C-alpha cells in the first residue's frame, strides 16, 4: 500500500528480585510475573504497532537479545523498510499511576526518533492515569498503547 495504520498494546506487571540462601548457596528469588524483557511497555507497544501496520504480526517474531527493547524496535523497523515503508508518524500513550515523566518524555522521543530513523517531530509520547482505578490505578503494573502510520519511502 501507500499508507498503513498499526496498533499496539502492552502491559508490564511489577515484579521483584531478592537474594536467598538455600542449601548454603546464594540463589536469586523472583517475586511477581516472570519478565522475558526489560518491561519497556512504550517500546513494546510501539513495536507491535509498526509490525502490525506492515502485516508482520507482532513483537513475538523478531528473533526465532530480548532483554533490550530498542534492539527489538530497530529489528522491527529494519523489516518494515524491507517491505518498502518508512515512518509517517507515531503516537504513544503510556498508562501509569505516576506523575513526573515529562522531563523524560523528550529523551524517549529522541531515542525512538533515532531507532526509527525519523525526525523527533514525527514522534509523540504522552502519559495519562486511570485515576487510581484498575490494575494500573492500584499500581500493580503499567500499560501502554500506540498507533503508527507507515508510508512508502
Task: Please give the residue ranges that form the binding site for a second copy (CB under 8 A).
Answer: 1, 3-13, 33, 48-49, 51-60, 88-93, 95, 102, 105, 120-124, 126-135, 137, 140-141, 143, 145-149, 151
| 75 or 140: CB nearest a second copy | 140
Which is nearer to a second copy, 71 or 134 (by Cβ)? 134
What is the rounded distance in angstroms from the CA atom of residue 86 to the CA atom of residue 65? 24
CB of 26 to a second copy, least distance (A): 27
All cell numbers assigned to 115: 531507532
For 46, list phi and psi in degrees, rounded to 5: -60, -35
> In angstroms, rounded to a whole number, what is the distance separating the alpha carbons of residues 150 and 3?
6
Q: Of Mn ion, a second copy, none, which one sits near residue 84, judging by CB under 5 to 8 A according to partner kind? A: none
Residues between 7 and 26 with contacts to Mn ion, criterion CB under 5 A: 10
Residues that bind Mn ion (CB under 5 A): 10
Amino acid at each position: 500500500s501507500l499508507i498503513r495504520i498499526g496498533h499496539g498494546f502492552d502491559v508490564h506487571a511489577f515484579g521483584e528480585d531478592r537474594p536467598l540462601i538455600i542449601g548454603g548457596v546464594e540463589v536469586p528469588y523472583h517475586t511477581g510475573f516472570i519478565a522475558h524483557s526489560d518491561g519497556d511497555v512504550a517500546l513494546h507497544a510501539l513495536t507491535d504497532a509498526i509490525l502490525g501496520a506492515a502485516a508482520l504480526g507482532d513483537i513475538g517474531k523478531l528473533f526465532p537479545k530480548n532483554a533490550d527493547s530498542r534492539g527489538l524496535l530497530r529489528e522491527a523497523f529494519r523489516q518494515v523498510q524491507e517491505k518498502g515503508y518508512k515512518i509517517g508518524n507515531v503516537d504513544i500513550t503510556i498508562i501509569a499511576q505516576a506523575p513526573k515523566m515529562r522531563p523524560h518524555i523528550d529523551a524517549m522521543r529522541a531515542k525512538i526518533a533515532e531507532d526509527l530513523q525519523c525526525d523527533i517531530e514525527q514522534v509523540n509520547v504522552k502519559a495519562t492515569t486511570t485515576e487510581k482505578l484498575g490494575f494500573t490505578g492500584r499500581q500493580e503494573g503499567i500499560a501502554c498503547e500506540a498507533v503508527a502510520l507507515l508510508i512508502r519511502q
